[PDB]
Amino acid sequence: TRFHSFSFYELKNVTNNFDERPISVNKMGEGGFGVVYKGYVNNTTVAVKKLATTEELKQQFDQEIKVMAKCQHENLVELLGFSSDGDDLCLVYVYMPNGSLLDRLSCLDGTPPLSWHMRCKIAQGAANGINFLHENHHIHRDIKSANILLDEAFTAKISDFGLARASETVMTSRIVGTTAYMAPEALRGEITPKSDIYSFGVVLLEIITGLPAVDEHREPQLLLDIKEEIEDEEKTIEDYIDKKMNDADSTSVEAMYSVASQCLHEKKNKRPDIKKVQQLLQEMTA
Ligand SMILES: COCCCNc1nc(Cl)c(-c2nc3ccccc3s2)c(N[C@@H]2C[C@H](CO)[C@@H](O)[C@H]2O)n1
Numbered sequence: 249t250r251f252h253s254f255s256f257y258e259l260k261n262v263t264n265n266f267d268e269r270p271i272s273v274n275k276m277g278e279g280g281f282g283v284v285y286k287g288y289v290n291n292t293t294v295a296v297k298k299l300a301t302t303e304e305l306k307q308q309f310d311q312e313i314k315v316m317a318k319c320q321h322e323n324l325v326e327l328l329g330f331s332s333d334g335d336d337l338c339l340v341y342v343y344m345p346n347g348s349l350l351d352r353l354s355c356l357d358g359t360p361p362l363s364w365h366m367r368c369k370i371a372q373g374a375a376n377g378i379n380f381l382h383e384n385h386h387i388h389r390d391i392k393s394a395n396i397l398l399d400e401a402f403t404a405k406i407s408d409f410g411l412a413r414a415s416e417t418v419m420t421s422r423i424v425g426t427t428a429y430m431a432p433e434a435l436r437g438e439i440t441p442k443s444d445i446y447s448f449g450v451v452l453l454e455i456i457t458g459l460p461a462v463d464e465h466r467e468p469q470l471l472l473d474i475k476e477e478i479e480d481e482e483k484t485i486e487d488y489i490d491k492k493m494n495d496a497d498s499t500s501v502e503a504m505y506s507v508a509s510q511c512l513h514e515k516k517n518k519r520p521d522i523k524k525v526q527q528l529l530q531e532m533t534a
Pocket residue numbers: 271276277278279280284294295297325341342343344345346347348350351394395397407408409
């Protein structure tokens with residue numbers, strides 16, 4: 249697939265010379281080291297990711313284009329174009345008005361809490377995006393709620409393919425990802441789609457509880473450990489369900505938790521593949 253060849257100065261103009269301030273009062277954030285700026289061009293709102301070692305920075309930009317050229321799906325963010333003529337390298341995407349699942353789970357800037365009904369649809373949507381990537385022999389290497397973007401109708405879109413790796417178990421010296429979401433073997437340097445499943449189980453626990461993967465002022469500081477308190481019969485998942493929901497029945501919440509439990513197996517070979525995860529989430533609703 250081919251993309252629009254945007255000029256650096258057109259992107260510099262529509263993003264106000266790459267301003268570092270927020271929208272209130274561009275800056276948005278940086279998932280894979282590249283400041284995302286809000287922009288408007290050709291009567292359509294966009295998100296411009298300016299990248300941002302010199303060759304490793306360029307390898308992050310080249311992979312994104314190589315992966316998105318091949319990968320086209322409704323549950324992945326769309327790349328509209330990019331820019332090479334400038335000093336820095338830019339990647340233009342279709343703007344997502346509901347931000348990340350992280351910011352919507354935390355109600356950042358006063359947004360209403362997502363209902364259980366929207367949460368199930370986002371879980372199913374996110375799991376289609378991972379299935380399409382794995383079907384097409386790609387490992388995301390950074391599955392987290394901050395990397396699940398939400399469109400005009402709260403449709404889950406996986407994003408950030410700067411760390412994406414082809415498959416089509418390999419080992420690596422430069423270990424990359426988000427500690428709070430990573431699997432045991434990923435933290436050791438193994439590269440496998442089985443790690444993407446583990447990280448997705450952490451996202452399901454954030455969806456159910458509404459608690460972020462890591463909270464420094466919390467006990468336990470890591471969300472994945474809450475699974476062990478529930479397994480020891482000290483607490484139940486019922487006691488961790490997000491209280492900012494009025495439409496969450498126990499059967500569907502327990503059913504989502506069963507998937508998150510299986511996803512979070514420490515033994516990589518005991519975890520279910522994405523196609524099984526997708527079937528279980530579909531059976532949950534239905
Ligand atoms: C005013 O309403 C707010 C809506 C903001 N909407 C929005 N829209 C898009 Cl298209 C992106 C992209 N971010 C990336 C990052 C890498 C690759 C592709 C993309 S597309 C984004 N990223 C931010 C950075 C962060 C990820 O860690 C998230 O929490 C976001 O804040 N935020």
